[model samples]
Target: APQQINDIVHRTITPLIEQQKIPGMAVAVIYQGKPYYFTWGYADIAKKQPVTQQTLFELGSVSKTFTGVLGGDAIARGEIKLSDPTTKYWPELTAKQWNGITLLHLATYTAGGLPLQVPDEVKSSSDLLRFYQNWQPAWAPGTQRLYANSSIGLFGALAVKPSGLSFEQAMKTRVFQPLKLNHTWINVPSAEEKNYAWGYREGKAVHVSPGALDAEAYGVKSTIEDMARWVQSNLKPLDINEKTLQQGIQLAQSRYWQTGDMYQGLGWEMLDWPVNPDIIINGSDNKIALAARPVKPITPPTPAVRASWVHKTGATGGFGSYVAFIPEKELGIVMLANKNYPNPARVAAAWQILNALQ
Candidate 1:
């Protein structure tokens, strides 16, 4: 069975490597609680270094999942409330235009229409504060969702105030440490930096650049093994001793909002399993990722559904990643590529492999 699964992975990914000009990739799938991994191509094209299970790849927006979990943990500990106004923590945002935006809005990318990135002009804390002070909501809070790093990054920053830790520190203490993620980091240590993959963009080696809240938003770098373990934890949590952390994981997986057929989790996107691939493609398309879309609140949010497909996609200028898992089927997959390919290619590849195994 493992051989068959391995062959399926080869069949699914081989063509994409050639078609997309991807320099390298690390793919891991968990079937019936057992995990299989396949690494291919080169981590560095000129140096001819191959990708391995230990190779660290930037996770891009997938890092938001950690931020989301931290927010949930804060909620579980009663350190914060989703309904609390964000200005409660960042007093600087208490201006007239900033009123009525709650932590929920920030966590869910529903804070009016914050841009996908904090504008290039707003770099320092004072500049960021001024930007928020002058920002006008495109729609009422909870009425629409606009996917943005600014919203979720702010959510993570305020989520850990009660712990008196930086956003990165809170994630390390609350999420990574409890989950036992050894190879994951917002700042990859120098000792381990040697294994970090060189992301390829248009045949040129590159890496994610720093931006306002970049660390909170898209700064996680990790190996395939650590990512597989993360996927496994979502399918069935580890032997975690922290009750609030466990509760946080549960909250992160819960269905909190909906736009048409897709449902929103704290960080993941959810759709009923046995889904058509086209639906996934459309959901991950730029239209959905870039444009504001109306969403109905799942008042009294639905608890985690075993039958749903829970997933997230992340990309920086030079790297791309996707993570998906189905608890009911005891199935999960993580694909980390050195090159930033189209989201559909990643989705289609994972879908084909998952459909066969399931």
Candidate 2:
């Protein structure tokens, strides 16, 4: 079994590292409910430090889905209501559009024509709210979608408002603690700091520079082992029966809308069991597809197919990461690298690895 899985990874990845761009990476796979890891290249290129499970890599926008996860949990528990206005918790957010946007809209990127991001004019959370106050939507709320890191960052903050806890604290208690993710963090805990992998952009070392709401948008640092467990919990969450989590996982992957074959489910894009993975691997790589309007569901929200695929891609100036799984196959993969990789390449290579197994 080890030989099969190991060969599966090595064949595809060998040629990958031989190319330009990527310097080092750590990969994890949950095969038939068991965990396997593949560590390659260096954590620090010139320093010659090797990558390991403990090494941390920035997961960028993939982190948004976690906000999507927390939102779902809170909604299921009645902590945040789907029908409540965005201003319900923070009335100071007096943008006329606020009255129409709901938590679901915020989580799903359909917040009434929010842009890809607001001008960097505002410097604080208060300033951000004021910025939203005068802004005009590209379209009315619930009418279209735009992949806005600005909207997602705000959604995370809003989810925390009901609990009176900080974002990091709320996530620790509600999501991370229950999942037993020992090697993940918004800021790598001091104890695990030594294991933190330094990332590179064009071979220069760098780290995530937090902005007003960067942590909520694209600021998660995690290890492959921790992420593999994330893939595993998603693969089979019944052990804990934690419906909060079961529901959260479902909510995180649940389809909100689709445009032709391109599907948006909560924070992740999905592939039907029989569809060609290339459509998603390619269609989802660009901004237009991400911000493209979605057709309303013909019926109420539906569940993913048993062997259906769901994935999210994340990247920073320095690092890139991808997570994908098929619950029916009870198989999933987590790939993290110190240098950013193109999305089509990420999905192509990942699909090859999944294809090898079958």
Candidate 3:
């Protein structure tokens, strides 16, 4: 990495830590399958414990990538097909108006009308069946896009069922074991409890939900070192079959469906970066106005601008993380923070880092 890039990382992140009062942060960058890991600040302010590579924090929706990996493993093992209707495994779903919905639609967030988050009625794998049984469709499947956390969570459960293994067990067998990631877990062991990072809110140590019961959505806890291993896997699919790896990259990059300017892939969102001049309107109101807006429509970028980068972000109660990778350059950087800050500012900071690096 360039010295300027290192300067950019520190300049952008240090102020964020001070302003947000974030307790700690762990970041890892993988380029050409080599890892550079960094941890700054404290994991526990009261104890003055410094953050390290082994400080574990919830990955939040980044766990969706693991779910997608498990889905690919199921496909490779012939336990499930991406095209299979969800009703195939959970027959109760047959009664719902979901004839056109398939596992692919769920994974890609194209199962129109599904709520962004699963309804409270859905508490377990069986509850998902009951919830789908009476659910109604608001749009034709795959016709539109909506980011649905529940949909991907359901996909994880479906994959687990056909594999004849629990979601946690399936992930361990397929991804973690192959990569030798000991610090990553869907449900952390009680013995390793002391090492987990304490999440913070407004400068106070706060308790956030653990990933014990929510493996499909926001249930993976990992350290920066383990995340470095995961990024290495993404950079080079060493042990995984080429076909399975292609399926995942396709899902991650495919514009399966679009809603306005936002695009939905398997387990990722595509955002148009570097706001155009017209959208920026002199860049003054860009920050405040853009901050409040839910969906903004702008012209698509030129092909040259489009191929520069791709990225993903994850957010939960007390944790937020961002990952951006350049396929052309074969470099990826991840920033995992232990506080829930506004995502827009985080995205801007990440873009600045990437811009300086390039």
Candidate 4:
């Protein structure tokens, strides 16, 4: 199996990037507690920078799951209660529409209704608060599962409240520092920005712009080595001996809701393990996968579905990323690229390659 999986990794990525038109990409994996890293092509074609585990790429909404960890950590510390009403701690969200919306709802992307992106009117902290104060749900809480950056941004803000620290500071203190993820950052510092990959579109470079709660939601930038540590933590599954981290991992990984053909946990998108490759293939096609949120809510699957390898996909104007792992198997995969490849194409390739491990 090791030989087979090794061959699959080498065989899948080299030509796969060429076929997909990806300028450059980084990948990391965990196998039986050991780790592997790989890179191909140029992160910056003009500069001829070959992508590596040291190169940084915008993680986009993949950062949402980190925020979920933040929330879980806070909960484990008795900083917040998931069952509390959305308006309980933040008086700003005391609007009737926000009623019944809990921190759990936001973490799970079931916050009644919120847009995929920060609304135009919400350009700043005060502006977001005002928007939330007056917001109305298209559907009641627990009724839908559309993608939600704004909601999660608000949720991230709340998750850090108990730390009595800034979101940036709290995340580092609670998550990054403990894990020793020195190269991961929600906001790329000035000196490190140079290492951030320059995303390309049709030979033209593109980068992220300032938007409401961008850093808190979709703005994390990380290198493959740092992400490998993250993958390892997940591989341990609630095994962190630290009280806070263990509880957080438990809460974050717990299946909280199900929608359509997919299952939702605190932040991860889940699929039953030993899954049909075509299942992810069909669901991951860029055309269909681009929705900002889930369509509607229904009864989640049984606890057995809890026995799944969680996955999450992320995209920016120029970057696309995906991560998935099966804790039971001590297997995980992370992919980050500087250019937008079709979501379906990347996942399909990763899924097909992962089969050799099975």
- The models' CA-based lDDT, in order, is 0.88, 0.78, 0.67, 0.78
Task: Evaluate model 3: give its TM-score.
Answer: 0.83
lDDT digits (tens) for residues 99-186 of candidate 3: 8788877886667667666676556657766776767767777665556676787788887787788788888877687668898987
TM per candidate comes to 0.98, 0.94, 0.83, 0.92
Candidate 4, residues 1-358: lDDT per residue as tens digits?
5666667887888777878788889988777767788888887888898887799998888888788888888998998987788777688666677768988788777886687777866776688788788777787787777677877887888878768898889889888888889999877889997788998777789888878887678888899888878878866855566789866866777667765567776666777787877778777774555454444443442332435767888888889898888877777889999887878877876776666674
Model 3 regions lying over 4 Å from their true place: 124-126, 210-213, 238-252, 259-263, 270-308
Global CA lDDT computed for model 3: 0.67
Clashing pairs in 3: none
Q: Which is better, 2 or 3, measured by TM-score?
A: 2
lDDT tens digits, residues 77-124, model 2? 778865578888778887576777887677767776677665677787
Q: Name model 4 segments beyond 4 Å from true.
A: 1-4, 286-306
Ranking by TM-score: 1, 2, 4, 3
Positional deviation of residue 260's Cα in model 2 after best superposition, in angstroms:
2.7
Clashes of each: 0, 1, 0, 5
Cα RMSD of all models vs. native, in order, equals 1.1, 1.8, 5.0, 2.5
lDDT pick, better of 1 and 4: 1
- Minimum summed lDDT over a 10-residue window in model 1 is located at 232-241
